[PDB]
Each structure stands twice: as C-alpha cells, then as structure tokens.
Amino acid sequence: RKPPKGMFLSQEDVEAVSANATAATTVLRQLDMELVSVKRQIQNIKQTNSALKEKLDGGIEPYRLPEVIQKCNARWTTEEQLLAVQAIRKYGRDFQAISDVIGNKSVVQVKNFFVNYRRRFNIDEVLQEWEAE
C-alpha cells in the first residue's frame, strides 16, 4: 500500500522528474535557487531587525513613573468629582482609565457615579461631546 518510510514518492512528483531528459536537473535547480533566494532575505530581515533593535537600547527605563499605592476611599470630594467630569470628556466609558485618573476610586464607584451625579453634572451632554471627537 505504502512506500518504505521517509522515501517520498507520489504520482505527481515522478511525472515531473521524468517529463524529459534533464527535467530532473531543472527542478532541482529551481530549488537550489529558491533556497539561495530565501537564505538572503533571511539575512536582510535579520539585519533590518538588528537596526530596529539598536534603537530600543535602554528600553523605556528613564521613562517610567513609580507606582502610587493609595488606599481606596468612599466619599467623593469636589476635586475628585471635577476630575471625573474631565476624565469622562477625555475618554467616555473607559471606567478603568477614569478609575486610574482619580486614583482613589474603584471602577464600580465610577459606574455608580455615572448615574448618581448624572443630572447635576450633566454627564449626558459630556458623552455627546466626546463622541464627536
């Protein structure tokens, strides 16, 4: 039913090597050239990528900011309320970001904010303005 193992012999490949006298040499020269071809686009992207890798030297370590550890609080101070309205305008719906702007306010309180202080802070128009941008 099947060849010895590792031997590669399908009906398609035998015909393509018998079709003429040097039809053997041709298709094994087609392949030596298709492999020189690939081994230097290897070496060319391996060199392009050596240059892009030179630009990332140092990573972004000068560019970090320390982690502020601050215990989450319940009451909304007026300053915190004001930050939220501005965060809403700069984002809108990304409660995780807003939670990170205000710093001492979790993502559930932010969503609860959205409807508690909804009238008084006119959160409705605010999101309309964000969507235009």
Place this chain on the structure above:
Amino acid sequence: PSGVEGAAFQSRLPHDRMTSQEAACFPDIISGPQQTQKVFLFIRNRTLQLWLDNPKIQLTFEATLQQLEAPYNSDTVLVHRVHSYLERHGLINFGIYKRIKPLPTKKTGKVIIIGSGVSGLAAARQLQSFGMDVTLLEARDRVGGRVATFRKGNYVADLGAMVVTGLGGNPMAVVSKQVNMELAKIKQKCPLYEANGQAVPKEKDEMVEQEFNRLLEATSYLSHQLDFNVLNNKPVSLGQALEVVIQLQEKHVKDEQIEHWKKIVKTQEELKELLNKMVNLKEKIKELHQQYKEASEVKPPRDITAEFLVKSKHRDLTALCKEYDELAETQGKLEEKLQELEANPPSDVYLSSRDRQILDWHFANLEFANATPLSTLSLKHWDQDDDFEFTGSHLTVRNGYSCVPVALAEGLDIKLNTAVRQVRYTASGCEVIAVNTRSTSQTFIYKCDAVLCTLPLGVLKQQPPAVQFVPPLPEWKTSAVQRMGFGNLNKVVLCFDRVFWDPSVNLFGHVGSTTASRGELFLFWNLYKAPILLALVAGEAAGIMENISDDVIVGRCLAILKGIFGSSAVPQPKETVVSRWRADPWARGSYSYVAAGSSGNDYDLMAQPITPGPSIPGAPQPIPRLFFAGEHTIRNYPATVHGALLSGLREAGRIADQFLGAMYTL
C-alpha cells in the same frame, strides 16, 4: 521441514498439492476423489524420501514398494506409476548412482547433444539412463562449460561458477553426496575499504547499506504500486528507477530545507513588525513623558484642569508602558522561537560524495549478482525468480567445481574439440554438421532422431551466426533470443606465496573512485585452502577490462591490495589468471539476466522444442526434433548451475516421453 514433507520440499514440490506436471500424467487421480490424492501425494513423498536418504544407489520400483506400508502398498500399479513418473523427470535416480539392474543391452532411438555444460551432461546421463544412444558434441577441449576450474600445482580456483546457493531444496545437495565435493560455508562479513585504503567506519557502512536496501524497496514500490514501467514508449530499467528514486530523495531534502527556512522568514517578519510597534511606542512614550514633566513642573496649588492634565498624562504613560511591556514579552518569545529553529536545521544533503561512493559499491554488488549494468535489467521482472531461493548459507566448492562435470561426464560418449556449425532437422530426423576446432577443414556428420541444444544464450545470439539452423528458428524463438539479456562478469585469480589478509574473512570490498568504475575490482574472495585471492569485475567494468592486458589488470589488483595492507605485505603473485567470458567464443558472456523489455516468459519460449514441417505435403503432423536446455531455458532458476542441471533433467524427461512413450499416463 522434516519427514515425508521434507522430501517434497527438498524436491521443490508442494507436499500437500499435486503440481501441474502431475496433473498432466495423473488426470485420473487429480480429477478424482480427494482421498486418492492424499494416497498419491504420500506415495510420491515417500518415494522421494527413500531416494533422498541414500542417493548413491538406484531406487528400484521393487525396493520402493517394499518399504511402503499398507494401505499405501495395496495398489501396485499406482505405486509403479508414481515411481516411473519420478524416475522419468529426474526427481529420483539422477546424477551418479550405481545401478542394480545393469543397462539395457541394446539402445533405442539416437540423440545428439550440443555442448557438455552441466545442462548437457545432466540430460546425457539421463538419456543413457533410459536406454538411449547419446553423443555429446563439445567445442572445448574439456567438459563443464561455464564451470571452469583453474588447476596448477596446489592452486585451484574456479573461473566460472563457484558458489552453491544453499542446500535447501537444491538439486546440487543430492549431487554433493554423490560426488566428493568439499563444501565450505562462506562467512557473510564483508569489510569495505575505500580507494585511500582506510576501512570504512562501521556506522557509515550500516547507514549506506540500509539506504541501499531502502532504495531497492522504493523501486519495487514504483513498479508494483505506481505502475511506473514504461517511459517514452520504452521499458523502465532498474537503473533508471534507482535514479528516479535518488532524485526524488534529493528533491525532498531540498523541499524541506525550503520549508524550514521559510519558517524563519515567517517569524523574523513577525518580529520585524513587532520591533516596528516597539520603536513607535518608545516614541509616543518619549514625548508623552516630556509632556508629563512639563505638566508636573507647574507648581501647586493648581486649578483642576491643570491638575487633571498631570493625572491624565500619568495614567496614559502607564497604560502606554503596559503595552510596551507586553510587547517586549512577545518580543522575547519570538527571539527564542528563532534560535530553536536555527539550532534544529534539517539534513544539509541526501548523500555526500563519500556516501554516494560507498552506495556505488552496493550497486556493483547488484551488477555482479545479475552480471549486467543495472541500466539493462527489467525493473518489473529482474527479480522474478526470488520466490524460489534455496534456504541455508551459500557454500563454495573448495576442491574446484569442475569436479562435478568431470564426474557426470564419466561413462558418456563425448566428442571434444568438435564445434557444431549447422543443425539440420527434418520430419524424418536430424543431422548435425560439426568441424574440428584444431583443424577446421576436417568435417563431421551426425544423424539422429533428436538434437538437444544447450548452446549458451550468447552463442545463440551471435550475429553473424556461429551455428546455422536449417530450417531457421521460427521468429517466436529468435525474438525470445534477442529480447533476453546475456550478461558478463569476469574474475582475476591471484596466487600468492603467503596469506597476508584476514584468514577469518572470506570476502572483502574495495570502494570505487567513480560511478563508472564501481565494478572494476570491487570485491575479493578468500575461498580456498591455498593462498588465493580472487577479484571480481562486474557491471560496465566487465566489458571494458577485457580490452586490457593481464599485467595492467594484475597491477591495479596489486595497487588496491597495497593500499589496504601496505606495500610491504603484498608480494608479487606466483600465478595469475584473468577470465574473458564475453571474448570466449563458446560462451559470448557469463550468464543470462531479465533484460528490460523481456520477462520470465521468454525463458519459457527458450524451452519450447521445435517441430519441423512435414516432408511430404499432406503427411501427418510430425514429432518434435530440436530441444533446448541450459541456464537460459529454466524460468524459475536461471543463470545458475542448479538451473542448468535441472533443465537437462527436464529435456531428458520429455525427449524420453517422446521417443520411448510413457506408460505411466494410463
């Protein structure tokens, strides 16, 4: 196999089945009830046993029936009828046995036998055994044909056949007990040595050999599963198919280097696009940090938009730093998935210059086995006789194989130095015109009822004829003669004044420089008591070394042997002999092979006898008059001594059946 069933196996016969031949002589038994068949089959097997256990004396019907026990000895005619069939077709009482019943005083019919090869001798023995008048015409000054044996002092080395291919069902087994043949098993170990003279390392030898055998199975798969047996209206040869297989393995080595490096580009390019996001991100980060400093430089106390700027920028740079952290994590996984592939590359080549040289030695071994370039063997059929391999180790004949012809020859009317030049066969008999080899003018005429031709196939092939048939052989026979292949291998016999090789090694190889010389002095045999090395010349080398002097040839032999054992340990040879079988006019080659475009059925054509037309038109359809035997006429055992011998037995059976009748069919 043992018992009665062993005798049927040792006689190349199914112990539990009637053969096509036995059907022809016992059409009653085989179309009859299954019980009679087992009786018959036992009677055959029992008789064969009796002969086999002591083949130095004749086995008479009386001796036979006596040692059968009932119910089997209840029918004397069935026993008499079995024993006679066996005796006729040379299954019992063939070779050299003392008779019990001395020969019929007067002889019946006359048969001329061309050639005293083993096949000649074997029929002649049998025909004389049957009360016929037998004369053999032999062109050489010696019996044996291609069983040649050099003899000089204690030096003995055959130039022709030298190997008995295993006694498991071999007729030579029986002949070995009849004649004092010293049979020494070979030892199978064959160390290869390349042209430099260094031994090939064990790991490489095993690697190549297995590839060799895997390449053979591959050709078989191309033949029987892919039906790759015609190429541009011509039969595919074995050699072509091996190329097509080797090419497709070199193809696949390249197909898979390509696919592997194509995995590195597909990943070096995922990395490129990711270094691009990371260089761009380290720029949105560089300015957004700048922006955060400036916002943080504004000193407090701040209004809330100015305070929201710092917080928003701080959050954004943190979010943007999460991103570049995740990306330098992917960037760490792909830079390792690229070193893993780099250190796990697939094989660079299919076979190197050096491996392909050692493989060429294994191809020279096939070229020796079939005495022909692989480019000529039929891919479909070159091994059609594998099913009938004997069992056991091969052996050599250590006192010379010639001892067998010479033994068979004793008692027979043999005209040596008589070359047949014309065979004339007519509805009323035959005449053979022969001449003296020493003086061609002397001319001889032999009249006979039948000619048994055992001319080598290379002789029968010769253009212009060495032997003219009158009337000419029908086209169906001459086309079989053209289609078949008649190969060539030669031997160099080196006689020394000391053993300087491994005495516990019977044979050892020598790897060729090039494909074209893979056959040139590729193997050496240490077979004999005396110090004789014996060096083969196979494949395309065989036909070309015949145009080169003995001394140029022994020189290359000495060279090769120097490289393997060093110049000091290899002396000049005392005696040297170099064969040229293709040059020999009584052989024109060495043995036959299934050429591309031929088949084993051509061997059956070579065996059919010739029946001349009628003398008087409208006279009754005549008898067959011209019969053929020899190595090329036996389908299941060609190019061997045992096949030669069996074909002689076969013709002697059917000539006797024809000219003495056969009562065993009633």
